[PDB]
Design an enzyme around this catalytic site. Sequence first.
Site, PDB file in Angstrom:
ATOM      1  N   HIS A 195      -3.533   6.025   3.170  1.00  0.00           N
ATOM      2  CA  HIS A 195      -4.384   4.898   2.811  1.00  0.00           C
ATOM      3  C   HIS A 195      -3.835   3.620   3.437  1.00  0.00           C
ATOM      4  CE1 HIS A 195      -5.880   1.818  -0.221  1.00  0.00           C
ATOM      5  NE2 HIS A 195      -7.022   2.523  -0.173  1.00  0.00           N
TER       6      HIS A 195
ATOM      7  N   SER B 114     -11.089  -1.085  -1.342  1.00  0.00           N
ATOM      8  CA  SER B 114      -9.837  -1.087  -0.583  1.00  0.00           C
ATOM      9  C   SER B 114     -10.064  -1.373   0.908  1.00  0.00           C
ATOM     10  CB  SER B 114      -9.072   0.228  -0.764  1.00  0.00           C
ATOM     11  OG  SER B 114      -8.837   0.377  -2.161  1.00  0.00           O
TER      12      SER B 114
ATOM     13  N   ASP C 145       0.851  -1.191   0.000  1.00  0.00           N
ATOM     14  CA  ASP C 145       0.000   0.000   0.000  1.00  0.00           C
ATOM     15  C   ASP C 145       0.886   1.240   0.000  1.00  0.00           C
ATOM     16  OD1 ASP C 145      -2.321   1.841   0.661  1.00  0.00           O
ATOM     17  OD2 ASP C 145      -3.345  -0.178   0.921  1.00  0.00           O
TER      18      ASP C 145
END
Length: 356
Positions: free
Chosen positions: A105, A289, A42
């Site tokens: 994120h 996600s 990520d």
Amino acid sequence: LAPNDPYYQQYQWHLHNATGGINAPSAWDVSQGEGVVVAVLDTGILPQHPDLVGNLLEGYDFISDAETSRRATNDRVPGAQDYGDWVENDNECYTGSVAEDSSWHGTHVAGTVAEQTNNGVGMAGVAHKAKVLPVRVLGKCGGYLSDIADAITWASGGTVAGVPANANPAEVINMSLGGSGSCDGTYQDAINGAISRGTTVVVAAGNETDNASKYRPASCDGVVTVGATRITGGITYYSNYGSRVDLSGPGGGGSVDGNPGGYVWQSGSDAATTPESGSYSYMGMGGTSMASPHVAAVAALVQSALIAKGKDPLAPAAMRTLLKETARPFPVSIPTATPIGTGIVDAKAALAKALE
Ligand SMILES: [Ca+2]
């Protein structure tokens, strides 16, 4: 288990809601994922977030482009610090792209996986006694196929030139990321290597309201492709779909379901650019996600329970069949044109079947 985290009860529907959550309270009475490593590929990590620290390994930064990583060199380096993926101007990433703040994120995703729980701080996570191995592959404007490919190899314990051997090979890889195009030979080979090492690879289906077979690694052979559901248990407006989607997890329906019910909630920052421009916080986000780490963490709960009982961990094919076979069927009709797998991942059902 009903843990004491201050914002768990009001915010974390994706954990405990009867129609859209993954039945974590009950799973947590059997397993918390102790002893298992989940690799999170990520944007990187905020390693001292006080609700994460404690469940994080050092990990690695695979981004081989200084402008993308915001580091001083094109090298891959130890550690996974997120430097911020903000993009100041529209069109910097591609014609039509839009300026945005840093996402944090991967810290969000890592929280879903293993946010410290029952610790009197913040929010909860699913596999809250597992370790996250953070592997940074995404930066400004995203990341590169061959960094993502190599990170897969390394995370699952294979050898990558220029990177020291991984002392913590991962039982599970999470990829809350994708791109246009059906699976290519490079991704598939890397995925194949990870599976041959015993690693389960779980990926987000994508958010284009479109056929998952058109995106990667969604459409790759051998992975667990994860759609997105709402707090209501129905399909989200954005979820990709199609016969490649195995099952779904809570992604958050967006504004239609309000605040907090539209969003998944975990560890993050309010920083707009660099880490230093803001402070540790809890953020709410929507997407496949967010759904994918719920599934990846359930895989972790199950491997951990099997080991705790002196049983053999499941191989990747077995794990995927199990998650699919024990998914809770949708409490609301899914449209025929847009199938999103067998149901919503159910951590408790997954455990009950694995353990006998
Ligand atoms: Ca907490």
